[PDB]
Design a protein around this ligand. Structure first.
Ligand code: ATP
Ligand code: ATP
Ligand code: ATP
Ligand code: 5GP
Ligand code: 5GP
Ligand code: 5GP
Lengths: 473, 473, 473
């Protein structure tokens, strides 16, 4: 990357320290920019969801993959749950979404709870697999909390067979009272739902699919235990990408795990991390990793800085590591500390092929945690860290229960953070709109038609603390 | 521009980052400074009101031009509404101001709401075009909300013929209970009003007038659609200056827009923006722009930094762009981020010929928005951005409503900020006093007698965060 | 009235002091109760809107009369304004309501301000008298404040010819996105609007109409000046009922005013007030009033108690005055202090034929005042008193500016109180539902099929401060 003349500070830079200078541009429209990645992940937008139990679930995996991202399932997820999750995602339709379903005998109180597991604003009542009506949050108000859903359900709703073009479904919903269109399978049973915004998004985002045309999903593994056997099972379970994840990636045990997995010739892209140095990036690639995950310190759930003083300002870390990886034909994932679209854009400008987002996506309907409301009625969800699941552990074979608590005494605890939902647009797809709208706008400011040109053409500069505060928050 | 020895930071500077070192001065008085601009705008003070619907209305256009500034009508204002505004502004008196007018049959409730559209402190009751009385906020207190204006109006007020010397009107109002002089035409109809402060300001500010002696006014146009026809239409409506405005000015579609307008030979100064680089300043001037508008990021309504990471600290943007425009015989407007008089002074010191002020002026009586009151009953008004009216858009001809919603999903939203009024001096002329009083003081401290001498003689320095904290807020 | 054995307190009673004891009832449902009054007012529900400028506007007069009440126009309204209000009200349809109308050239900012003049939730865009679309508050969000109505209007709306059965119009709106049906005259122009609730209300409420089938309206007159001439003009302007109104009704000047209006033999029912004594009730009836208005002290804008110590608890006042009026074949209106449906029910149980409501109805969309919002955006409007418009004043002939201020020094000021709108249901018709629903339930609890039977069969008891606190607020 190029920095403005004289911008060579005596410190490393975070996302807040830098800005992009616009260049001469012939890229007319935001939609002229190609946001697809070149690192082999298969993502059509530069967004990866972090391997965190607070974020990476079956609903998140489905929703983000349909919009071109990919979700890394958290490590130490039992292999039966992995295969169960993979089969669910890869059986999802590429356009039509999976709705919340209700029994006619479910209570209004139960319906109010389940409605916010998706962003559709309505749930479908099903009897013998067939949709019989729609349930909205409005129908649940002013009625007996334990009245049956059969009573308040709306019988009249827009329906269309699955496979109908999004533009047509969009037109059917124009004068509908409810913005949900129930999609019917060939035999008349429930296929899914498509909303007007969901139909628009189908003509904006390209789904991230495997060779069979099914949604992409990824899995992560720690460097403890038998890493080759675990990675092999994940591959056999259907994962399209593997992530070898640990807190300190520049470590002998991580180099072993990469070689053990690379030697199995699984044929999937191999991500490994995390490191913040060019030396660590090189060693991990030479061990057989095609993609290096970068980030030690910036994570929202990461207390490494205050515990150990170890860390690195993320933007500087991504610049040095992406340069090192590109010299060797590899790629870099910017992992941790992403709070705003500009963070994604700056990480791509810095040379990352993909940006990994964790805590930000906990504050969405589709994240696995329960929807909560703080003192001020504001909706939120809690993000929490993976703790010891990212740490190196000695062999617990033949471990006294004394030793179990001995090793547990020093191990990092699970910290918590409140992630509030946008009171208007609380779905993860709204944040993808947020993110990709910003990055597309960055490319038009830079003069780039795609992500490769963004990193090639970007001009960057450094600002003081008052510099970041320019504009509107 | 000269900086103190060794002040060569490794970053770009905002207005907060710099200060002016006083020089040796023989400039005797604040009033001996000449604030006229040399850029062909015609302003006699370096103040331009931004092309924003939240600020640039006809009341603002009249009031600012009479005091030497100029207002840029926002782009996409219908041409018929442009013509009414220009005709209203150019029919105003150069000394006497247009008051709020009331019918005798208006309700006290309506009168009370209309009083704050101006800063005179009284509205004039009119019958067949002639003044019959004055209405004040105090006359509206304690009366029935729907009593008629005729019952609370004062029939005793100071009156004088239009053209009376401001000095004499000032003396006629010395012992008047109401500080409003009602000015009449020879046939007795209302010509306007003049307060004691308005009489003082006539001897301080030079109106910005056209060749025919009528108040100056500008109009903005976006680079979408037919820019040439729109620009010509604005010229025929009577615009004294054209502003070709877009968020990213350094792109092909702007360069072609400037050329299409320049080749029509409309005979008006052409402004184009926004850019923040020397390369952009040169490319806009080469395409035919006479003035370059500078500012990407600093706008109080601008979310570009947080959305895209794109932007540049405004002070460094102006220094680099003013130098580039000067070598080509051009000029630079400093657009965005002005909150205090020092920002205007520093922008001029950096080499700008003129300073475009936006959201700050929304918090005035004369701005188009309604006067609001917060939880503490403080008066304020909402500023809001122009949003997609500054953005590039592909041709929308024959677009389906699906395609309309598609492009609409990613378009910039209208952000909102609250601009509080000074509970004492809430008129835009009070801000103009504030702004120009400080810019005149800056020149006396520097030793300059005019705006060019300010840029030539200024010595600047860089400070830390604590450096700005010195003094009083 | 009958009181429980031993309930003979040594004090007079407010509405909070008494409770109704259920009796044995054969009344099937609320709808079997006949709520029409027998005092000659013509109301079909026992609701009269007070003669107060904060409440009794033309929109209130139309809305309340269509639902069976009547509105008393405030005294001292110029006779020309009286005539226009009567003509407007008497030209309204008995079923279809008058909507808020907008031009396509109106601003969005003016649109959502005019929307709250009615409870429909939509305004009708009119082009040459023909309905071309609807504007909702949702359409005003997210667009430029000064955009035109043309840009946000919805061209799709349910329409039907005026005179269509309310049940049919109700069905046409079942699946409509907007709950407003645009009613058209045979030539296609806008006849009015009807909502699903508006159609329902047409089957519950009987419009209060004159002999020609036009909506009823009343007007008030003070006892100063030439009362006979004032009352004659109000009758010729079309008033269906006259209210002679003064703070202290038991005085010689009021008795003279009644005899002067009675001797004109205008043929209209004559209300006179206010008194709280049996002797006052008899003297006003014997002077020629057919209805005595009862209430000194309880009005929400009334500061009589704190200024003078004069006043009477309203329940005992009504009980004593209704009984005295009954012996002379007259009727009593309960004027002042109504805050809840219970107060209406208790006033009727006490023997009032009608209940006058003031400040409570100021907190509705249809009241004349502007809609306001407090610190928390909670909607409200201000109610204010009529003050000196209810007071005796000597002839102002030969009044020096000194004499005007002498009499104004002791004049009653205009008291103010904030009446909050119910955030769910802000129209006055929803309060009519609230009021008449409770009064109908009171009748079924007492076993009465109508208002006379309510007063004949009711059993009352007295409670302490803790007794009122029973139940839910
Ligand atoms: N057997 C398991 N052991 C440990 N963690 C599990 C197991 N099964 C699921 N999880 C975790 O529980 C969370 C819930 O995700 P999961 O995929 O089960 O569903 P989801 O996306 O929340 O959707 P739904 O609400 O429909 O179940 C995730 O963090 C997942 O990793
Ligand atoms: N026809 C129109 N279409 C869109 N915007 C308009 C139109 N007419 C005016 N505006 C906008 O409305 C705002 C106020 O315009 P106007 O000319 O009324 O100014 P003003 O000073 O507020 O005048 P006044 O207060 O006397 O009505 C400005 O933002 C202007 O751009
Ligand atoms: N000429 C007048 N003098 C004094 N008070 C008046 C006069 N005309 C109307 N009012 C008062 O103004 C209030 C509103 O009256 P009305 O509803 O007729 O006004 P409007 O302006 O036609 O209504 P809207 O706000 O619905 O347009 C009432 O309190 C009424 O008594
Ligand atoms: N130190 C630490 N880092 C964590 C933990 N859980 C996740 N992380 C890191 O933080 C990243 C997410 O960053 P975020 O998007 O929340 O800023 C993860 O991808 C991972 O690299 C944890 O418990 N401790
Ligand atoms: N990005 C962006 N810039 C805006 C918007 N509205 C106005 N601006 C810019 O900000 C300037 C005004 O800045 P202000 O004086 O309000 O800080 C305008 O002249 C224009 O250049 C908007 O919605 N978005
Ligand atoms: N003392 C007094 N009574 C008033 C005033 N305005 C209205 N009233 C009385 O109060 C009644 C309304 O009572 P409310 O329904 O507001 O409690 C009116 O009908 C009238 O009798 C005022 O300013 N002073």
């Amino acid at each position: 990357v190029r920095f403005l003349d004289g911008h060579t500070p005596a410190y490393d830079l975070t996302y807040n320290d830098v800005f992009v200078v616009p260049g001469r541009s012939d890229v007319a429209s935001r939609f002229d920019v190609d946001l697809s990645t070149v690192d082999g992940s298969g993502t059509t937008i530069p967004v990866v969801v972090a391997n965190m139990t607070a974020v990476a679930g079956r609903r998140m995996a489905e929703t983000v993959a349909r919009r071109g991202g990919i979700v890394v399932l958290p490590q130490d997820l039992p292999i039966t749950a992995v295969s169960e999750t993979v089969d669910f995602v890869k059986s999802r339709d590429l356009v039509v979404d999976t709705p919340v379903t209700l029994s006619p005998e479910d209570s209004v109180s139960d319906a109010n709870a389940l409605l916010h597991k998706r962003a559709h604003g309505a749930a479908v009542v099903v009897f013998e697999g067939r949709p019989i009506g729609l349930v909205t949050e409005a129908n649940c108000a002013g009625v007996d909390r334990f009245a049956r859903v059969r009573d308040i359900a709306l019988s009249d709703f827009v329906t269309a067979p699955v496979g109908t073009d999004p533009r047509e479904v969009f037109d059917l919903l124009e004068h509908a009272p409810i913005d949900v269109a129930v999609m019917t399978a060939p035999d008349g049973t429930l296929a899914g739902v498509l909303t007007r915004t969901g139909a628009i998004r189908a003509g904006i985002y390209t789904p991230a699919v495997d060779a069979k045309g099914r949604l992409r999903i990824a899995a992560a593994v720690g460097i403890n235990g038998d890493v080759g056997a675990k990675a092999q099972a994940l591959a056999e379970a259907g994962a399209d990408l593997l992530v070898i994840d640990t807190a300190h990636g520049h470590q002998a045990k991580m180099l072993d795990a990469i070689k053990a997995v690379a030697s199995l010739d699984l044929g999937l892209p191999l991500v490994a991390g995390n490191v913040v140095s060019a030396e660590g990036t090189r060693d991990l690639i030479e061990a057989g990793a095609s993609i290096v995950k970068v980030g030690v310190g910036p994570g929202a759930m990461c207390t490494t800085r205050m515990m150990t003083g170890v860390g690195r300002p993320q933007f500087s870390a991504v610049v040095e590591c992406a340069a090192a990886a590109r010299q060797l034909g590899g790629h870099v994932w910017a992992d941790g500390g992403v709070r705003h679209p500009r963070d994604v854009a700056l990480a791509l400008a810095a040379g990352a092929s993909n940006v990994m987002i964790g805590s930000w996506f906990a504050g969405t309907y589709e994240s696995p945690g329960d929807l909560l409301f703080d003192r001020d009625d504001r909706p939120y969800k809690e993000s929490y860290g993976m703790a010891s699941k990212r740490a190196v552990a000695a062999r617990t074979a033949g471990d006294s229960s004394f030793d179990r608590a001995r090793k547990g005494l020093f191990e990092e605890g699970i910290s918590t953070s409140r992630m509030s939902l946008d009171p208007a647009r609380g779905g993860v797809e709204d944040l993808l709109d947020h993110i990709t709208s910003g990055v597309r706008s960055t490319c038009t400011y830079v003069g780039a038609a795609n992500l490769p040109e963004l990193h090639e053409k970007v001009v960057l500069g450094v600002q003081s603390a008052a510099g970041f505060a320019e504009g509107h928050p």
